[PDB]
UniProtKB/Swiss-Prot annotation:
Belongs to the peptidase A1 family. Its EC number is 3.4.23.22. The keyword Hydrolase applies. Residues 17-328 form the Peptidase A1 domain. GO terms for molecular function: aspartic-type endopeptidase activity. Keywords: Aspartyl protease, Disulfide bond, Hydrolase, Protease, Signal, Zymogen. This is Endothiapepsin. GO terms for biological process: proteolysis. The active site is at 35, 199. Disulfide bonds join 255-290. The chain holds residues 90 to 419 of 419 of the full protein. It comes from Cryphonectria parasitica.
Amino acid sequence: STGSATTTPIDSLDDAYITPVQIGTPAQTLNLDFDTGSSDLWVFSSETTASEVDGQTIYTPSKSTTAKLLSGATWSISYGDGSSSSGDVYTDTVSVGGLTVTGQAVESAKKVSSSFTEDSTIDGLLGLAFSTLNTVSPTQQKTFFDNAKASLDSPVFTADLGYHAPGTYNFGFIDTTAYTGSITYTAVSTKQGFWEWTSTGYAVGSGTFKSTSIDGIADTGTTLLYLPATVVSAYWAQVSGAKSSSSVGGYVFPCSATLPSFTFGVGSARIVIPGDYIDFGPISTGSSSCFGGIQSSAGIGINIFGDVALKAAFVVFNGATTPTLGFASK
């Protein structure tokens, strides 16, 4: 089997991407944030504290004839950005782009943090990291991909995120028309539960490529590109007037600037992030100070190849017995 679904930016900055997901019988369609950095499929629901729901579409398990309460199971998750959610668990039928999994754990939120409430466009998350990170207790549950894997034509999914435009998540096949040149595959460590790999280096603009190993994670659920302070300083040094602002919380730059591209290595291959992908707009409405899309990972504890990086590529998440990651230009 295969599936194919369009993923759509939630706003004009590509702060996140939402993908429609059918849950239950009859289907209840929710727009979920596909997150290769976590491993829970959780949703706003009829059980969510009412004051914490503000415009989201909810899953109502009592209206699904295939929903079953997973007795005694609870979940609770905290994300790198400080947000969190928790609740109980149902199993139900879940379909993405025509690919159906029966018995999928659907984690129903009883509580969500303010950042989730305040984002009316995201109805929940669909985790696509390794199932070892799933938070369901006392019996850990499998991701949608893990459940689908054996049935797929090939045990893979691909992320093709757009810049200021829709893109595609495919399951079970590689669309050879969706990229240029070849896909370069690179080793993955699953030791921390992530799609963790090592970039071979970087360049700023038309500058010389610096060969250096950068361990990090391919994370569709993180907006920006978080890299070591040395790398980030070298990038922003090429933007006149750019500076790190502790009050704002990272590098800012004059909105009048033209940003240089940023290149990262994948083996001997090179992925080029155009400068415009690195612009996240005014820090506050009407400001002429703009927020940068490349930021320091210092104090995160890990480098993160988030959407800024991934949307410059066609990315293969190869869930073979020994997982790997593939990157192509597009």
